[PDB]
Amino acid sequence: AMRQCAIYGKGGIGKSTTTQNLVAALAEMGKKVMIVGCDPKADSTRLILHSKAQNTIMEMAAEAGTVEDLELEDVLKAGYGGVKCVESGGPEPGVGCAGRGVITAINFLEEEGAYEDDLDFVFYDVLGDVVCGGFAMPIRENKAQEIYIVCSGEMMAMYAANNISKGIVKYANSGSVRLGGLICNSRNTDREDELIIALANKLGTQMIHFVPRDNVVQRAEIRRMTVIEYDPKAKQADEYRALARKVVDNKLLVIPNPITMDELEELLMEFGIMEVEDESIVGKTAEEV
Amino acid sequence: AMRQCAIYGKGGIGKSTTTQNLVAALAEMGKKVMIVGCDPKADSTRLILHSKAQNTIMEMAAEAGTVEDLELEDVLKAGYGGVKCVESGGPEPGVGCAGRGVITAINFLEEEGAYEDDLDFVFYDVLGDVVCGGFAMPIRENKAQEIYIVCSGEMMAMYAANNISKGIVKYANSGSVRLGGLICNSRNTDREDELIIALANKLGTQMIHFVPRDNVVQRAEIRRMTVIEYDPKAKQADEYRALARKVVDNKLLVIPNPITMDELEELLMEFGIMEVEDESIVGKTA
Numbered sequence: 324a325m326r327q328c329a330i331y332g333k334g335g336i337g338k339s340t341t342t343q344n345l346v347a348a349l350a351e352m353g354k355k356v357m358i359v360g361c362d363p364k365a366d367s368t369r370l371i372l373h374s375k376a377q378n379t380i381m382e383m384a385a386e387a388g389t390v391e392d393l394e395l396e397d398v399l400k401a402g403y404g405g406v407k408c409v410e411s412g413g414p415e416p417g418v419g420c421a422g423r424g425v426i427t428a429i430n431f432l433e434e435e436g437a438y439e440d441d442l443d444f445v446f447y448d449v450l451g452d453v454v455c456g457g458f459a460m461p462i463r464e465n466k467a468q469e470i471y472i473v474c475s476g477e478m479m480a481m482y483a484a485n486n487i488s489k490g491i492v493k494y495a496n497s498g499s500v501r502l503g504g505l506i507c508n509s510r511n512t513d514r515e516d517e518l519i520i521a522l523a524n525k526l527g528t529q530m531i532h533f534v535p536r537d538n539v540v541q542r543a544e545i546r547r548m549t550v551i552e553y554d555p556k557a558k559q560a561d562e563y564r565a566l567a568r569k570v571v572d573n574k575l576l577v578i579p580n581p582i583t584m585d586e587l588e589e590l591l592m593e594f595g596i597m598e599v600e601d602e603s604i605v606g607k608t609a610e611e612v
Numbered sequence: 613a614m615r616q617c618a619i620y621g622k623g624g625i626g627k628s629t630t631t632q633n634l635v636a637a638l639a640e641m642g643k644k645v646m647i648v649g650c651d652p653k654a655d656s657t658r659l660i661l662h663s664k665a666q667n668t669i670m671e672m673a674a675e676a677g678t679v680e681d682l683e684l685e686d687v688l689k690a691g692y693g694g695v696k697c698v699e700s701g702g703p704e705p706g707v708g709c710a711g712r713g714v715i716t717a718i719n720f721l722e723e724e725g726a727y728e729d730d731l732d733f734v735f736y737d738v739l740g741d742v743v744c745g746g747f748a749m750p751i752r753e754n755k756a757q758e759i760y761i762v763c764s765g766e767m768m769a770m771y772a773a774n775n776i777s778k779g780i781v782k783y784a785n786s787g788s789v790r791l792g793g794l795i796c797n798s799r800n801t802d803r804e805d806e807l808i809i810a811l812a813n814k815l816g817t818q819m820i821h822f823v824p825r826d827n828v829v830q831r832a833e834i835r836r837m838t839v840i841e842y843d844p845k846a847k848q849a850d851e852y853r854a855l856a857r858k859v860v861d862n863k864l865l866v867i868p869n870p871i872t873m874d875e876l877e878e879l880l881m882e883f884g885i886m887e888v889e890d891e892s893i894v895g896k897t898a
């Protein structure tokens with residue numbers, strides 16, 4: 324039926340551009356999609372709308388002052404490929420939980436049954452810098468069944484992926500939340516792909532795709548658009564089509580096996596990212612040794 | 613008497629390293645300091661203690677049933693310069709507020725009288741990727757009055773400073789929590805110091821110090837130590853000493869003026885970070 328997915332990832336590594344280019348490729352495939360951005364900043368839909376920034380629910384839930392009031396023309400703007408783009412926004416720093424913007428928006432959308440109105444895929448675009456009750460909501464309430472984690476060969480990105488996995492673990496029984504795989508957004512780090520493949524193996528999942536750096540992304544980004552609509556004949560455009568088809572045809576939805584800090588640091592060390600500590604010189608000043 | 617401070621800032625920009633290096637310089641300087649780490653990850657004290665990972669109040673609380681049994685000598689360890697250290701810890705990922713461990717830590721350190729046993733400064737090392745719940749707690753409950761924000765010449769690091777600054781405004785009349793300045797953790801970017809001086813001035817504050825990048829930092833860190841303890845003669849040791857002195861003499865404690873995204877983007881464009889929006893080029897790439 325309609326598939327509900329979520330792309331989780333640490334911020335600062337192009338996750339949203341990947342989510343958006345991913346959904347664009349899906350749209351070109353003739354798939355009906357909707358993006359629910361769950362990022363406070365709200366950049367999960369600009370590339371699809373060619374906008375500077377989309378209006379969030381929170382912002383215009385402070386205009387009419389009451390949670391439910393905004394047919395979808397002011398709140399749910401459809402853009403490229405028929406992809407419906409929505410933004411949750413977040414509350415003011417210090418005003419209740421920041422996941423209030425998320426928890427709000429779904430109910431509101433389930434109230435307009437936007438989920439039932441001709442849809443094949445829904446992708447919540449969520450940040451994983453903090454995996455707390457607020458941001459794990461889509462998972463917790465069983466709102467997102469297929470999770471895909473965007474990460475890079477870096478400590479925090481991999482730490483964030485492990486924590487998202489822990490949160491998937493926690494709810495794998497109460498509902499049907501499952502990890503579809505890891506998406507590595509290359510940051511031009513050596514053995515990055517092999518590091519993520521390794522992490523995929525350890526977590527007991529798969530690195531469903533390696534997204535390369537290709538300046539046509541930054542190029543199309545400036546255009547406030549995806550690499551797909553920009554130049555569908557770009558070599559990078561094919562990487563999204565590939566990822567997209569693996570997502571569509573993904574049978575592998577697992578319950579992850581998180582690793583310990585040692586295992587992670589272990590991984591990071593054998594791939595040349597983290598320095599191996601020399602036990603002897605620990606706590607010795609530069610003059611002593 | 614004791615000054616309760618907190619270093620706020622987004623993750624991944626070298627904040628905990630800057631905090632421990634500043635605290636070591638303070639201790640080298642003769643000051644009696646306590647660091648209360650508040651990052652669920654718990655990495656705010658290892659350089660002071662030359663440790664693998666300090667056991668967090670949360671990990672322990674989960675052991676002897678609850679936080680009532682916990683002993684203070686098991687929670688608070690002292691290291692270089694006599695600096696005392698504690699790690700709040702945090703709940704398991706996805707279960708409740710990620711930053712709640714602070715409430716548990718503060719309440720315990722309170723009952724145990726930790727704050728009256730010879731302390732000149734307390735520094736909560738708090739994350740600021742989001743400013744809500746347990747993260748905003750030291751501000752909300754008036755637990756730290758002097759806030760210093762670590763940031764760099766990057767969009768997200770700047771955005772977090774602004775939201776943290778927003779959090780301070782919100783609790784203005786709530787207590788005496790004020791912003792004491794921005795600390796720039798250089799990322800070896802062009803005109804980075806200028807960029808932060810620009811934002812601090814826009815905020816109604818000061819860039820209290822620009823921390824340069826320097827390999828001596830990693831050389832000290834690989835040994836689980838601060839630059840002050842590892843190489844006191846280093847140029848970088850003086851930088852942390854300068855910061856320490858200015859923080860100690862700081863008198864500028866204000867209620868910040870949160871800028872807008874457009875202003876943010878203005879500083880970034882203006883300083884060689886973001887590019888000016890071309891326009892014929894938008895909407896219909898080719």
Ligand code: SF4
Nearest residue numbers: 420421455457709745
């Ligand atoms: S649960 Fe998360 S979103 Fe909510 S207040 Fe806590 S840290 Fe913030």
